[PDB]
Structure formats: C-alpha cells, structure tokens
Write a protein that binds this DNA or RNA. Sequence first.
DNA 1: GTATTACACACCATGTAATAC
DNA 2: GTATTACATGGTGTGTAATAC
Lengths: 89, 88
Amino acid sequence: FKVSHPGEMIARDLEDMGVSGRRFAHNIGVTPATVSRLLAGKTALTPSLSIRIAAALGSTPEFWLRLQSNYDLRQLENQIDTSGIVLYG
Amino acid sequence: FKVSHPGEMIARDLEDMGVSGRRFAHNIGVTPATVSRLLAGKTALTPSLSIRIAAALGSTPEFWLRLQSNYDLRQLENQIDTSGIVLY
DNA sequence: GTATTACACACCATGTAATAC
DNA sequence: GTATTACATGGTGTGTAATAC
Ligand SMILES: [Mg+2]
C-alpha cells in the first residue's frame, strides 16, 4: 500500500523543533522547493543532501544516506529477478 | 582510510575465479560495456547492480551498495562547504 | 510569515555499435 | 575468445518563479 519514505523522518524532526521547511532549506543552503520535494518523497535523499542534513540534525551523513539506500532496495528487490543469475563457487 | 572504487574489489573477485567481463556481464543481465565502466570506476555501483552483483558474488546488496556510498561521500566531504549550517 | 510545482536545464548510468587486442 | 568508448537516450535532482494560503 502506501510506504514510508525517508522525508517523513526529516519532517518529524522539524516539527518537534518548530522549524519550518523554509528556514531549514535556507539553513542547509538549498531552496525550499527541494526540501518540500524531499519531505514529500518526490525526490531522493542524495549523498550531498545527507551531508548538509547531518550538519543540521546531528547524526552521521551515512545515517541519512542509508535511509535512501534501504528505501531503494525495498523497491527494487520486488522488481529485479535474480533466478537467472548464477552464484559462483 | 583509503577508499578505492568498488570496481577494484569486483575486479579482483572475477580475476580469482577466471570469470571475464563479458561472462560476468551476461550472468547478471547487463552489457559488457556496463561491467567495463563499473570496474574502471567510470560509473557508479547503482542499487540495481548491487542486487545483481550479490546474486552472483554472494554477499548482500547492502554490502556492495555501501561500498559505493562510502566512495560518493568521501568524494563530497572535501567539496561541500558545511561551515554555514547551524546545528540544532 | 508559510508550502507546492510546472518548466528548463544539467548530470549520469546504460544499451548500441564500432573499435582494437 | 577478450576489453574499451563515443554517441544517443531515458531518468531525475534542483533552481527559478509562479501559485496559493
Ligand atoms: Mg539506445
């Protein structure tokens, strides 16, 4: 059904702090268009965004980027067929 | 700590097994141009390839994809100017 | 003050096909 | 048998600016 994207987690941290999407965008050096797209799931949490987010929300850049990597794998593992691929010895 | 391209590890695994580029390409479902580009470091190890690579080389898609995430971040650690952001 | 989104643009991974050993 | 690369192309992340509250 409807799945959860890593933008929802950025949003809950901003709501808990009373920081709007427009100040958060200006803070990380990005226009508010991208933050709205990010938080809604329209676009992906790129590695460069995981670097600014890490400097604003206080975790490792790998942490925020991992959320997008797992999101991509959860989507693609249902789509890519691996029956024809041979495991080597 | 040294961050090589993910293709260098894939290249050494294929060399140790006798598998060529075209053979490995045919196994996972991509053209030999893709495997060449991947091994030379010209292109990135996408999440799609990480699933195909783990089916042939036998680790996890998270493993192969995390090698590329560490490469991409390390290249961007030195370029993104983070001295203007305030921590909450 | 706040958020959403079409548009133009730029970046990039991949198949095709020609190249070379 | 092997590997490499220019080209066309589809995909997509982002700023600009419009729209709306
Ligand atoms: Mg084509």
